[PDB]
Symmetry: C3
Subunit: 30 residues, 3 copies
Amino acid sequence: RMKQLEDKVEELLSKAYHLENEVARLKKLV
Amino acid sequence: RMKQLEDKVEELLSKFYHLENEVARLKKLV
Amino acid sequence: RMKQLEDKVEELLSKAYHLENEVARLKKLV
Ligand SMILES: [Mg+2]
Ligand code: NA
Ligand code: NA
Ligand code: NA
Ligand code: NA
Ligand code: NA
Ligand code: NA
């Protein structure tokens, strides 16, 4: 079951990295 | 051990879904 | 393999609090 855990955390890392970008983007638009 | 992590990632999935909605609302107002 | 998953999940949860703060900050500014 460590395979499902690893694929979920890969998805969450990409989520986090994309949210990080949108936070940095949104910071410059205010 | 595997149960503890599962409940933590399922928490992470709900968290990330929630921040994504908030960002989506920040972008519309921005 | 297992300890790295647990460590990465800790690292995600901590960054989600960090992002929660950043998002709430922007939430004011728009
Ligand atoms: Mg999976
Ligand atoms: Na921008
Ligand atoms: Na932008
Ligand atoms: Na276990
Ligand atoms: Na069970
Ligand atoms: Na999901
Ligand atoms: Na390790």
